[PDB]
Amino acid sequence: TKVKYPDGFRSWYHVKSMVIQPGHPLENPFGGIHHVYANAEAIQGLRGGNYPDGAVLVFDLFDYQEDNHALVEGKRKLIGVMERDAKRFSATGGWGYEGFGEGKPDKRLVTDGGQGCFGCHAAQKESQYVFSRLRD
Amino acid sequence: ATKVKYPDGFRSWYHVKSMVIQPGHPLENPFGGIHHVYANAEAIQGLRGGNYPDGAVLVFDLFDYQEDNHALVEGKRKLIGVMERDAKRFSATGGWGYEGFGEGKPDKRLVTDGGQGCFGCHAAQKESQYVFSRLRD
Ligand code: HEC
Ligand code: HEC
Numbered sequence: 088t089k090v091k092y093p094d095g096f097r098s099w100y101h102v103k104s105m106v107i108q109p110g111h112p113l114e115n116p117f118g119g120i121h122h123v124y125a126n127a128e129a130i131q132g133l134r135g136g137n138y139p140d141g142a143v144l145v146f147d148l149f150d151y152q153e154d155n156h157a158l159v160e161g162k163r164k165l166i167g168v169m170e171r172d173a174k175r176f177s178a179t180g181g182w183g184y185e186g187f188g189e190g191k192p193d194k195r196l197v198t199d200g201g202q203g204c205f206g207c208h209a210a211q212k213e214s215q216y217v218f219s220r221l222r223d
Numbered sequence: 224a225t226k227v228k229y230p231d232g233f234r235s236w237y238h239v240k241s242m243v244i245q246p247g248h249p250l251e252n253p254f255g256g257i258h259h260v261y262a263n264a265e266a267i268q269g270l271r272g273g274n275y276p277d278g279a280v281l282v283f284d285l286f287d288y289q290e291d292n293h294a295l296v297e298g299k300r301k302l303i304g305v306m307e308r309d310a311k312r313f314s315a316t317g318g319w320g321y322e323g324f325g326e327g328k329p330d331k332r333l334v335t336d337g338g339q340g341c342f343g344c345h346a347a348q349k350e351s352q353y354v355f356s357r358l359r360d
């Protein structure tokens with residue numbers, strides 16, 4: 088029913104990164120530099136298999152500071168989490184969605200059972216609701 | 224110096240940090256783009272405040288980016304820079320060997336001077352064993 092905090096996510100495989108700057112549609116509240124991490128089970132789905140139960144993707148979001156035309160990572164704003172479990176999270180397409188303010192376990196952000204996150208991710212139905220693609 | 228080994232499988236290693244260097248910045252040429260730093264297990268012992276065992280490898284992975292409606296999106300890989308720790312083998316440049324691979328390709332080795340040019344800049348970080356990156360949370 089609740090998404091588990093993903094302890095140890097920082098040592099998982101770095102899928103990709105992206106910078107969202109002011110003015111982008113997703114600025115609020117996804118503005119900043121973000122990195123996507125996948126555990127072993129999520130890698131299987133990214134590589135083209137089905138996502139097994141227990142797959143986890145993390146969206147790791149940092150503020151940045153612009154300093155002499157370099158963007159430098161500042162403080163972590165939040166993490167977004169998707170946890171695969173076809174049965175428990177069937178209401179939201181088999182993924183449970185949670186946000187943790189500042190990446191801390193006790194700061195849960197989602198208040199609508201994940202429906203809001205799910206409504207945008209539904210656009211990626213064809214890729215099992217995941218936007219990120221593996222690059223080399 | 225012997226050759227620095229191409230770091231096979233580095234994409235699976237621990238992601239240390241990232242930074243974006245944009246036009247105007249002093250390092251735009253040649254380090255412009257979005258870069259990511261990776262470290263293998265031995266390098267982590269060194270980054271943690273331990274000492275660096277021989278066999279520690281750090282990788283700087285550099286991508287061009289594109290601007291897309293107030294997002295910077297990663298484009299093509301321009302190169303990877305590699306530091307491979309071997310105190311005796313690479314003593315001429317501080318115990319680390321330095322190599323670049325154009326577009327990340329094993330056959331596109333870039334360094335022609337034994338790593339002296341790369342070392343000239345990293346020597347500023349003598350105090351941290353020639354490594355600029357710091358571990359974060
Ligand atoms: C559209 C309006 C979105 C909403 C609302 C949410 N997310 Fe999403 N998310 C979106 C995009 C475009 C992306 C891809 C970013 C990229 O670098 O390409 C993401 C990514 C994630 C991920 C990473 C896995 C993936 O699908 O690519 C996670 C773990 C994730 N998002 C979680 C998440 C949660 C918990 C949300 C509600 C609190 C949520 N997202 C909303 C677009 C949108
Ligand atoms: C100054 C003019 C530099 C020269 C020349 C080279 N590098 Fe360097 N390097 C420099 C900086 C400021 C940084 C830090 C980037 C960051 O995000 O903080 C780096 C980093 C690396 C790394 C990563 C490990 C570390 O020291 O932080 C590697 C593996 C690396 N650089 C390799 C490398 C090689 C192979 C070079 C010559 C081909 C080289 N660097 C030159 C600054 C400068």
Ligand SMILES: [Zn+2]
Nearest residue numbers: 110111292293
């Ligand atoms: Zn605009």
